[PDB]
Amino acid sequence: GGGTLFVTVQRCRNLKNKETIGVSDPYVKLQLRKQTRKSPYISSTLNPDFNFEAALEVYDIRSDVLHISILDKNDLVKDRLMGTLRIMLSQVAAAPGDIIRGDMNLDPEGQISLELKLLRH
Ligand SMILES: [Ca+2]
Ligand SMILES: [Ca+2]
Ligand SMILES: [Cl-]
Ligand SMILES: [Cl-]
Ligand SMILES: [Cl-]
Ligand SMILES: [Cl-]
Ligand code: NA
């Protein structure tokens, strides 16, 4: 393998509310091997428009996995998990143009609009 994965999270829709009182304040967390990224949060919404851009280095295209989490930012208690999605880098590498772009289903509910572009080295 070996490449750079460009990730754009455009938005999420229909997220599961996790806030004890009020509406959750979502942000994106990305993880690939030892790399982590976190977007700024958006207050009081289950339908955030993030337009979040990141890049992660890929060390083995065949086996690497990108882990996406959507979390509720909290000030006093632990941030709570709203939804997750795993992307296998092999799926990106198989796609025409090494590009994937669509509205995907989060676990356990909600949708996420993403663009994933792999540049191979
Ligand atoms: Ca809130
Ligand atoms: Ca919160
Ligand atoms: Cl890993
Ligand atoms: Cl922020
Ligand atoms: Cl980044
Ligand atoms: Cl998943
Ligand atoms: Na998009």
Residue numbers in the entry: 474 to 594
Extract from the study:
Extended synaptotagmins (E-Syts) localize at membrane contact sites between the endoplasmic reticulum (ER) and the plasma membrane to mediate inter-membrane lipid transfer and control plasma membrane lipid homeostasis. All known E-Syts contain an N-terminal transmembrane (TM) hairpin, a central synaptotagmin-like mitochondrial lipid-binding protein (SMP) domain, and three or five C2 domains at their C termini. Here we report an uncharacterized E-Syt from the protist parasite Trypanosoma brucei, namely, TbE-Syt. TbE-Syt contains only two C2 domains (C2A and C2B), making it the shortest E-Syt known by now.
The structure was solved to 1.5 Å resolution using the selenium single-wavelength anomalous diffraction de novo phasing method. There are two molecules per asymmetric unit, both of which contain aa474-594 of TbE-Syt. The structure showed that TbE-Syt-C2B adopts a type II topology, consisting of eight β strands that form two sheets and a short α helix in the loop connecting β6 and β7. Additionally, there are two tightly bound Ca2+ ions, which are coordinated by a few charged residues in two extended loops on the opposite end from the helix. The interaction is mediated by a network of hydrogen bonds between the Ca2+ ions and the side-chain oxygens of residues E492, D498, D545, and N547, which are all highly conserved in trypanosomes. The main-chain carboxyl oxygens of residues V496 and K546 also form hydrogen bonds with either of the two Ca2+ ions. Similar to the Ca2+-binding site in the C2A domain of HsE-Syt2, TbE-Syt-C2B also has an extremely acidic “crater” on its surface. In the TbE-Syt-C2B structure there is also a basic patch on β2 and β3, which contains residues K502 and K511 at its center. Our structure-based mutagenesis studies revealed that TbE-Syt-C2B bound lipids in both Ca2+- and PI(4,5)P2-dependent manners via an acidic patch and an extended basic patch, respectively. Superimposing TbE-Syt-C2B onto each of the three C2 domains of HsE-Syt2 showed that it is very similar to HsE-Syt2-C2A and C2B, with average RMSDs of 1.05 Å and 0.75 Å, respectively, but substantially deviated from C2C, with an RMSD of 3.57 Å.
